[PDB]
Amino acid sequence: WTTIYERLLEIKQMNERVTKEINTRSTVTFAKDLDLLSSQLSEMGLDFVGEDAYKQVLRLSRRLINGDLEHQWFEESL
DNA sequence: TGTCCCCCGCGTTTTAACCGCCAAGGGGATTACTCCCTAGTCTCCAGGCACGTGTCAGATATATACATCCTGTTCTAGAGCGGC
């Protein structure tokens, strides 16, 4: 329990920085023109944009325990 | 018959083998729609089969000729003996 608690503390302490990192993810428009952005997790909804990172990680852990997340995709998302 | 070197029995230390556990994602298995081509005939005709036959390559034949193998004779090297 203390190990899981400290892991989630490590998640939450930098959460206020990563949340504004993905919220202000300034995608360059030139790569938008000829389609080089990584849209692998954007197709099935594993992206973190427009939403708090900790709550999304909580739902991700819930579905990861549920066994319908295709583990390596959750690995790449993290 | 001998030998010696090639293989077996055993001590030690790694080493990957098997089972313990977890996902992954191509992939075997199943179901369904549909579409091509293969089952089944009609007719025929042109390639395939039975018959007939001139013929041209193979076999028989034999003196001739290969052709290699066996054997006899001679050449040369090696060991033994005798003299200086």
Side-chain angles (χ1 to χ4, degrees):
Chain A
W1 217 318
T2 53
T3 311
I4 302 177
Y5 183 63
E6 288 230 62
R7 292 168 186 200
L8 285 185
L9 263 40
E10 193 176 1
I11 297 307
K12 193 71 173 176
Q13 273 180 351
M14 79 218 167
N15 180 33
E16 67 252 16
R17 317 306 307 144
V18 309
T19 319
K20 71 143 40 183
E21 149 58 23
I22 330 171
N23 277 324
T24 68
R25 204 153 260 182
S26 178
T27 65
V28 316
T29 201
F30 222 140
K32 300 291 332 173
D33 308 334
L34 70 185
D35 189 80
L36 303 96
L37 285 321
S38 178
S39 165
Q40 35 153 1
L41 325 159
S42 299
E43 292 173 353
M44 83 276 264
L46 257 291
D47 41 332
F48 276 32
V49 278
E51 183 208 12
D52 193 14
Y54 189 71
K55 296 316 189 243
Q56 184 47 229
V57 175
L58 258 283
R59 317 169 226 250
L60 278 197
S61 271
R62 281 178 238 149
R63 310 177 33 209
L64 201 282
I65 295 175
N66 282 318
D68 51 344
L69 208 49
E70 213 149 277
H71 276 203
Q72 83 282 4
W73 289 116
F74 160 78
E75 297 295 14
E76 186 74 30
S77 75
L78 274 203

Coordinates of all heavy atoms in Angstrom, one line a residue, chain A residues 3-65:
Chain A
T3 N 3.9 1.6 -1.2 CA 4.5 1.7 -2.5 C 3.6 2.2 -3.5 O 4.0 3.1 -4.3 CB 5.0 0.3 -2.9 OG1 5.8 -0.3 -1.9 CG2 5.9 0.4 -4.1
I4 N 2.3 1.7 -3.6 CA 1.4 2.3 -4.5 C 1.1 3.7 -4.2 O 0.9 4.6 -5.0 CB 0.1 1.4 -4.5 CG1 0.4 0.0 -4.8 CG2 -1.0 2.0 -5.4 CD1 -0.8 -0.9 -4.8
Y5 N 1.0 4.1 -2.9 CA 0.8 5.4 -2.4 C 1.9 6.4 -2.9 O 1.6 7.5 -3.4 CB 0.7 5.5 -0.9 CG 0.3 6.9 -0.4 CD1 -0.9 7.5 -0.7 CD2 1.2 7.6 0.3 CE1 -1.2 8.7 -0.3 CE2 0.9 8.9 0.8 CZ -0.3 9.4 0.5 OH -0.7 10.7 0.9
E6 N 3.1 5.9 -2.8 CA 4.2 6.8 -3.2 C 4.3 6.9 -4.8 O 4.7 7.9 -5.3 CB 5.6 6.2 -2.7 CG 5.7 6.4 -1.2 CD 7.1 7.0 -0.8 OE1 7.3 8.2 -1.3 OE2 7.9 6.4 -0.1
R7 N 3.9 5.8 -5.5 CA 3.8 5.9 -6.9 C 2.8 6.9 -7.4 O 3.0 7.7 -8.2 CB 3.5 4.5 -7.5 CG 4.6 3.5 -7.3 CD 4.1 2.1 -7.7 NE 5.1 1.1 -7.4 CZ 5.2 -0.1 -7.9 NH1 4.2 -0.5 -8.7 NH2 6.1 -1.0 -7.6
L8 N 1.6 6.9 -6.7 CA 0.6 7.9 -7.1 C 0.9 9.3 -6.6 O 0.5 10.2 -7.2 CB -0.8 7.4 -6.5 CG -1.4 6.2 -7.3 CD1 -2.8 5.9 -6.8 CD2 -1.5 6.5 -8.8
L9 N 1.7 9.4 -5.5 CA 2.3 10.7 -5.2 C 3.2 11.2 -6.3 O 3.2 12.4 -6.6 CB 3.0 10.6 -3.9 CG 2.3 11.1 -2.6 CD1 0.8 10.6 -2.6 CD2 3.1 10.6 -1.4
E10 N 4.0 10.3 -6.8 CA 4.9 10.8 -7.9 C 4.1 11.2 -9.1 O 4.5 12.1 -9.9 CB 5.9 9.6 -8.3 CG 7.0 10.1 -9.2 CD 8.0 9.0 -9.4 OE1 7.8 7.8 -8.9 OE2 9.0 9.2 -10.2
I11 N 3.0 10.5 -9.4 CA 2.1 10.9 -10.5 C 1.4 12.2 -10.2 O 1.4 13.1 -11.1 CB 1.0 9.8 -10.7 CG1 1.6 8.5 -11.1 CG2 0.0 10.2 -11.7 CD1 2.6 8.6 -12.3
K12 N 0.9 12.4 -9.0 CA 0.1 13.6 -8.7 C 1.0 14.9 -8.5 O 0.5 16.0 -8.7 CB -0.7 13.4 -7.4 CG -1.8 14.4 -7.2 CD -2.9 14.2 -8.2 CE -4.1 15.2 -7.9 NZ -5.2 15.1 -8.9
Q13 N 2.2 14.7 -8.0 CA 3.0 15.9 -7.7 C 3.4 16.6 -8.9 O 3.5 17.8 -9.0 CB 4.3 15.5 -6.9 CG 4.0 15.4 -5.4 CD 5.2 15.0 -4.6 OE1 6.2 14.6 -5.1 NE2 5.1 15.1 -3.3
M14 N 3.7 15.9 -10.0 CA 4.0 16.5 -11.3 C 2.8 16.6 -12.2 O 2.9 17.0 -13.3 CB 5.1 15.7 -12.0 CG 4.7 14.4 -12.7 SD 5.9 13.1 -12.6 CE 4.9 11.7 -13.1
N15 N 1.6 16.2 -11.7 CA 0.4 16.2 -12.5 C 0.0 17.7 -12.9 O -0.4 17.9 -14.0 CB -0.8 15.6 -11.7 CG -2.1 15.6 -12.5 OD1 -2.1 15.5 -13.7 ND2 -3.2 15.8 -11.8
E16 N 0.2 18.6 -12.0 CA -0.1 20.0 -12.3 C 0.9 20.6 -13.4 O 0.5 21.6 -14.0 CB 0.0 20.9 -11.1 CG 1.4 21.1 -10.5 CD 1.6 20.3 -9.2 OE1 0.7 19.4 -8.9 OE2 2.5 20.6 -8.5
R17 N 2.0 19.9 -13.7 CA 2.9 20.3 -14.8 C 2.6 19.6 -16.1 O 2.5 20.2 -17.2 CB 4.3 20.1 -14.4 CG 4.7 20.6 -13.0 CD 4.3 22.0 -12.7 NE 4.8 22.9 -13.7 CZ 4.1 24.0 -14.1 NH1 2.9 24.3 -13.7 NH2 4.7 24.8 -15.1
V18 N 2.3 18.3 -16.0 CA 2.1 17.5 -17.2 C 0.7 17.8 -17.8 O 0.5 17.8 -19.0 CB 2.2 16.0 -16.9 CG1 3.6 15.7 -16.3 CG2 1.1 15.5 -16.0
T19 N -0.3 18.2 -16.9 CA -1.6 18.6 -17.4 C -1.5 19.9 -18.3 O -2.1 19.9 -19.3 CB -2.5 18.8 -16.2 OG1 -2.3 17.8 -15.2 CG2 -4.0 18.7 -16.6
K20 N -0.7 20.9 -17.8 CA -0.6 22.0 -18.7 C 0.4 21.8 -19.8 O 0.4 22.5 -20.8 CB -0.1 23.2 -17.9 CG 1.3 23.1 -17.4 CD 2.0 24.5 -17.4 CE 1.1 25.6 -16.9 NZ 1.8 26.9 -17.0
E21 N 1.2 20.7 -19.7 CA 2.1 20.3 -20.8 C 1.2 19.8 -22.0 O 1.4 20.2 -23.1 CB 3.1 19.3 -20.3 CG 3.6 18.2 -21.4 CD 4.2 18.8 -22.6 OE1 4.7 20.0 -22.6 OE2 4.2 18.1 -23.7
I22 N 0.3 18.8 -21.7 CA -0.5 18.3 -22.8 C -1.6 19.2 -23.2 O -2.2 19.2 -24.3 CB -1.0 16.9 -22.5 CG1 0.0 16.1 -21.6 CG2 -1.2 16.1 -23.8 CD1 -0.5 14.8 -21.0
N23 N -2.1 20.0 -22.2 CA -3.1 21.0 -22.5 C -2.6 22.1 -23.4 O -3.4 22.7 -24.2 CB -3.7 21.6 -21.2 CG -4.8 20.8 -20.6 OD1 -5.5 20.1 -21.3 ND2 -4.8 20.8 -19.3
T24 N -1.3 22.5 -23.3 CA -0.7 23.5 -24.2 C 0.3 22.8 -25.1 O 1.4 23.3 -25.4 CB 0.0 24.5 -23.4 OG1 1.2 24.0 -22.7 CG2 -0.9 25.1 -22.3
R25 N -0.1 21.6 -25.6 CA 0.8 20.9 -26.6 C 0.7 21.6 -28.0 O -0.2 21.3 -28.7 CB 0.4 19.4 -26.7 CG 1.4 18.5 -27.2 CD 1.2 17.1 -26.7 NE 2.1 16.8 -25.6 CZ 2.2 15.6 -25.0 NH1 1.4 14.6 -25.4 NH2 3.0 15.4 -23.9
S26 N 1.6 22.5 -28.2 CA 1.6 23.3 -29.4 C 2.1 22.4 -30.6 O 3.3 22.4 -30.9 CB 2.4 24.6 -29.3 OG 2.4 25.3 -30.5
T27 N 1.2 21.8 -31.3 CA 1.5 21.0 -32.5 C 1.9 22.0 -33.6 O 1.2 23.0 -33.9 CB 0.4 20.1 -32.9 OG1 -0.7 20.9 -33.4 CG2 -0.1 19.2 -31.8
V28 N 3.0 21.7 -34.3 CA 3.5 22.6 -35.4 C 2.6 22.4 -36.6 O 2.1 21.2 -36.8 CB 5.0 22.3 -35.7 CG1 5.8 22.2 -34.4 CG2 5.2 21.0 -36.5
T29 N 2.3 23.4 -37.3 CA 1.3 23.4 -38.4 C 1.9 22.8 -39.6 O 1.1 22.2 -40.5 CB 0.7 24.7 -38.6 OG1 -0.6 24.6 -39.3 CG2 1.6 25.6 -39.5
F30 N 3.2 22.8 -39.8 CA 3.8 22.3 -41.0 C 3.7 20.8 -41.1 O 3.4 20.2 -42.1 CB 5.2 22.7 -41.1 CG 5.6 23.1 -42.5 CD1 6.5 24.2 -42.7 CD2 5.2 22.4 -43.6 CE1 6.8 24.6 -44.0 CE2 5.6 22.8 -44.9 CZ 6.4 23.9 -45.1
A31 N 3.9 20.1 -39.9 CA 3.7 18.7 -39.9 C 2.2 18.3 -40.0 O 1.8 17.2 -40.4 CB 4.3 18.1 -38.6
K32 N 1.3 19.3 -39.6 CA -0.1 19.1 -39.8 C -0.4 19.1 -41.3 O -1.4 18.4 -41.8 CB -0.9 20.2 -39.1 CG -0.8 20.3 -37.6 CD -1.4 19.1 -36.8 CE -2.6 18.4 -37.5 NZ -3.0 17.2 -36.7
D33 N 0.3 19.9 -42.1 CA 0.1 19.9 -43.5 C 0.3 18.6 -44.2 O -0.5 18.1 -45.0 CB 0.9 21.0 -44.2 CG 0.7 22.4 -43.5 OD1 -0.3 22.6 -42.9 OD2 1.7 23.2 -43.6
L34 N 1.5 18.0 -44.0 CA 1.8 16.7 -44.6 C 1.9 15.5 -43.6 O 2.6 14.5 -43.9 CB 3.0 16.8 -45.5 CG 4.5 16.9 -45.1 CD1 5.3 17.1 -46.3 CD2 4.7 18.2 -44.2
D35 N 1.1 15.6 -42.5 CA 0.7 14.4 -41.7 C 1.9 13.5 -41.2 O 2.1 12.4 -41.7 CB -0.3 13.6 -42.5 CG -0.9 12.5 -41.7 OD1 -1.9 12.8 -41.0 OD2 -0.5 11.3 -41.8
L36 N 2.7 14.1 -40.3 CA 3.7 13.4 -39.6 C 3.5 13.2 -38.1 O 4.4 12.6 -37.5 CB 5.1 14.0 -39.9 CG 5.6 14.2 -41.3 CD1 5.3 15.6 -41.7 CD2 7.1 14.0 -41.4
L37 N 2.4 13.7 -37.6 CA 2.2 13.6 -36.1 C 1.8 12.2 -35.7 O 1.2 11.5 -36.5 CB 1.1 14.6 -35.7 CG 1.5 16.1 -35.6 CD1 2.9 16.3 -35.1 CD2 1.3 16.8 -36.9
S38 N 2.2 11.8 -34.5 CA 1.9 10.5 -34.0 C 0.5 10.4 -33.6 O 0.1 10.8 -32.5 CB 2.9 10.1 -32.9 OG 2.6 8.9 -32.3
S39 N -0.4 9.8 -34.5 CA -1.8 9.6 -34.2 C -2.1 8.1 -33.9 O -3.2 7.7 -34.2 CB -2.6 10.1 -35.4 OG -3.9 9.6 -35.3
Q40 N -1.2 7.4 -33.3 CA -1.4 6.0 -33.1 C -2.4 5.8 -31.9 O -3.3 5.0 -31.9 CB -0.1 5.3 -32.8 CG 1.0 6.1 -32.1 CD 1.9 5.2 -31.3 OE1 1.9 4.0 -31.3 NE2 2.9 5.9 -30.6
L41 N -2.2 6.6 -30.8 CA -3.1 6.5 -29.7 C -4.3 7.4 -29.8 O -5.3 7.2 -29.0 CB -2.4 6.8 -28.4 CG -0.9 6.4 -28.2 CD1 -0.3 7.3 -27.1 CD2 -0.8 5.0 -27.9
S42 N -4.3 8.3 -30.8 CA -5.5 9.2 -31.0 C -6.6 8.5 -31.6 O -7.8 9.0 -31.5 CB -5.0 10.4 -31.8 OG -4.0 11.1 -31.2
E43 N -6.4 7.3 -32.3 CA -7.5 6.7 -33.0 C -8.5 6.0 -32.0 O -9.7 6.0 -32.2 CB -6.9 5.7 -34.0 CG -6.2 6.3 -35.2 CD -5.5 5.3 -36.1 OE1 -5.5 4.1 -35.8 OE2 -5.0 5.8 -37.2
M44 N -7.9 5.3 -31.0 CA -8.7 4.5 -30.1 C -9.0 5.3 -28.8 O -9.7 4.8 -27.9 CB -8.1 3.2 -29.8 CG -7.0 3.2 -28.7 SD -5.4 3.7 -29.4 CE -4.7 2.1 -29.6
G45 N -8.6 6.6 -28.7 CA -8.9 7.4 -27.6 C -8.0 7.3 -26.4 O -8.4 7.6 -25.3
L46 N -6.7 7.0 -26.6 CA -5.7 6.9 -25.5 C -5.0 8.3 -25.3 O -4.2 8.3 -24.4 CB -4.7 5.8 -25.8 CG -4.8 4.5 -25.0 CD1 -4.5 4.7 -23.5 CD2 -6.2 3.9 -25.2
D47 N -5.4 9.3 -26.1 CA -4.8 10.6 -25.9 C -5.3 11.3 -24.6 O -6.3 11.0 -24.1 CB -5.1 11.5 -27.1 CG -6.5 11.4 -27.6 OD1 -7.1 10.3 -27.4 OD2 -7.0 12.3 -28.1
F48 N -4.4 12.2 -24.1 CA -4.7 12.8 -22.8 C -5.1 14.3 -23.0 O -5.2 15.0 -22.0 CB -3.5 12.8 -21.9 CG -3.4 11.5 -21.1 CD1 -3.8 10.3 -21.6 CD2 -2.8 11.5 -19.9 CE1 -3.7 9.1 -20.9 CE2 -2.6 10.3 -19.1 CZ -3.1 9.1 -19.7
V49 N -5.4 14.7 -24.2 CA -5.6 16.1 -24.5 C -7.0 16.5 -24.0 O -8.0 15.8 -24.1 CB -5.5 16.4 -26.0 CG1 -4.0 16.6 -26.3 CG2 -6.1 15.3 -26.8
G50 N -7.1 17.7 -23.5 CA -8.4 18.3 -23.0 C -9.0 17.7 -21.8 O -10.2 17.8 -21.6
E51 N -8.2 17.0 -21.0 CA -8.7 16.3 -19.8 C -7.6 16.2 -18.8 O -6.4 16.2 -19.1 CB -9.3 15.0 -20.2 CG -9.9 14.2 -19.0 CD -9.8 12.7 -19.2 OE1 -9.1 12.3 -20.2 OE2 -10.5 11.9 -18.5
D52 N -7.9 16.2 -17.5 CA -7.0 16.0 -16.4 C -6.2 14.7 -16.5 O -6.8 13.7 -16.8 CB -7.6 16.1 -15.1 CG -6.6 16.3 -13.9 OD1 -5.5 16.6 -14.2 OD2 -7.0 16.2 -12.8
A53 N -4.9 14.7 -16.3 CA -4.1 13.5 -16.5 C -4.3 12.5 -15.4 O -4.3 11.3 -15.7 CB -2.6 13.9 -16.6
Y54 N -4.5 12.9 -14.2 CA -4.6 12.0 -13.1 C -5.9 11.2 -13.2 O -5.9 10.0 -13.0 CB -4.6 12.7 -11.7 CG -4.5 11.7 -10.6 CD1 -3.3 11.0 -10.3 CD2 -5.5 11.5 -9.7 CE1 -3.2 10.1 -9.3 CE2 -5.5 10.7 -8.7 CZ -4.3 10.0 -8.4 OH -4.2 9.1 -7.4
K55 N -7.1 11.8 -13.5 CA -8.3 11.1 -13.6 C -8.3 10.2 -14.8 O -8.8 9.1 -14.7 CB -9.5 12.1 -13.7 CG -9.7 13.0 -12.5 CD -9.6 12.2 -11.2 CE -10.0 13.0 -10.0 NZ -8.9 13.2 -9.1
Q56 N -7.7 10.6 -15.9 CA -7.6 9.8 -17.1 C -6.7 8.6 -16.8 O -7.0 7.4 -17.2 CB -7.0 10.5 -18.3 CG -6.9 9.8 -19.6 CD -8.2 9.0 -19.9 OE1 -8.1 7.8 -20.2 NE2 -9.3 9.6 -19.9
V57 N -5.6 8.8 -16.0 CA -4.8 7.7 -15.6 C -5.5 6.7 -14.7 O -5.3 5.5 -14.7 CB -3.5 8.2 -15.0 CG1 -2.6 7.1 -14.4 CG2 -2.7 9.0 -16.0
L58 N -6.4 7.2 -13.8 CA -7.2 6.4 -13.0 C -8.2 5.5 -13.8 O -8.3 4.3 -13.5 CB -8.0 7.2 -12.0 CG -7.5 7.3 -10.6 CD1 -7.8 6.1 -9.8 CD2 -6.0 7.6 -10.5
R59 N -8.8 6.1 -14.8 CA -9.7 5.3 -15.6 C -8.9 4.3 -16.5 O -9.3 3.2 -16.7 CB -10.6 6.2 -16.6 CG -11.2 7.4 -15.9 CD -11.8 8.3 -16.9 NE -11.4 9.7 -16.7 CZ -12.3 10.6 -16.3 NH1 -13.5 10.4 -16.1 NH2 -11.8 11.9 -16.1
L60 N -7.7 4.7 -16.9 CA -6.8 3.8 -17.6 C -6.4 2.6 -16.7 O -6.3 1.5 -17.2 CB -5.6 4.5 -18.1 CG -5.7 5.3 -19.4 CD1 -4.3 5.7 -20.0 CD2 -6.5 4.6 -20.4
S61 N -6.1 2.9 -15.5 CA -5.8 1.8 -14.5 C -7.0 0.9 -14.3 O -6.8 -0.4 -14.2 CB -5.2 2.3 -13.2 OG -3.8 2.5 -13.3
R62 N -8.2 1.5 -14.2 CA -9.4 0.7 -14.1 C -9.6 -0.3 -15.3 O -9.9 -1.5 -15.1 CB -10.6 1.6 -13.9 CG -10.7 2.2 -12.5 CD -11.9 3.1 -12.5 NE -11.6 4.5 -12.1 CZ -12.2 5.6 -12.4 NH1 -13.2 5.5 -13.3 NH2 -11.7 6.7 -12.0
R63 N -9.4 0.2 -16.5 CA -9.6 -0.6 -17.7 C -8.4 -1.6 -17.9 O -8.5 -2.6 -18.5 CB -9.8 0.2 -18.9 CG -10.9 1.3 -18.8 CD -11.0 2.2 -20.0 NE -10.7 1.5 -21.2 CZ -10.3 2.0 -22.3 NH1 -10.0 3.3 -22.4 NH2 -10.0 1.3 -23.4
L64 N -7.2 -1.2 -17.3 CA -6.1 -2.1 -17.4 C -6.3 -3.3 -16.4 O -5.9 -4.4 -16.8 CB -4.8 -1.3 -17.0 CG -3.4 -1.8 -17.3 CD1 -2.9 -2.9 -16.5 CD2 -3.4 -2.1 -18.8
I65 N -6.9 -3.1 -15.3 CA -7.3 -4.2 -14.4 C -8.4 -4.9 -15.0 O -8.4 -6.2 -14.9 CB -7.7 -3.6 -13.0 CG1 -6.5 -3.0 -12.3 CG2 -8.3 -4.7 -12.1 CD1 -6.8 -2.3 -11.0

